[PDB]
């Protein structure tokens with residue numbers, strides 16, 4: 001990994017760490033729409049994303065730069081904000097995890 005992608009990988013590790021588990025856990029795995037009874041999910045969300053997918057892509061060297069990584073993390077949050085009413089718990093959890101993400105992403109080395 002490039003220096004910037006090392007920083008990205010560090011962030012990803014943090015987002016998956018026990019430190020943030022109380023609000024990160026809905027983002028660990030793909031939304032299983034059928035299992036959760038969300039029969040409209042894939043009509044509304046055209047491009048699902050979650051942290052396990054981001055992790056697989058990082059491990060497989062799919063991301064060519066930090067921007068591509070960040071786009072997937074933000075897609076995951078955007079999907080949450082798109083699908084869910086803003087007063088649902090999962091949205092509050094997304095906002096908190098995105099705060100973690102954005103503040104550390106901003107510390108990207110040049």
Ligand SMILES: CC(=O)N1CCC[C@@H](Cn2c(-c3cc(C)c(=O)n(C)c3)nc3cc(Br)ccc32)C1
Nearest residue numbers: 026027031036038079080083084088089090091
């Ligand atoms: C609607 C709402 O506020 N919540 C609270 C948090 C959990 C959500 C349901 N859910 C999701 C989930 C659902 C939606 C709609 C979503 O956008 N994300 C990101 C995760 N992933 C889950 C994995 C497992 Br195991 C058990 C329950 C899970 C219900």
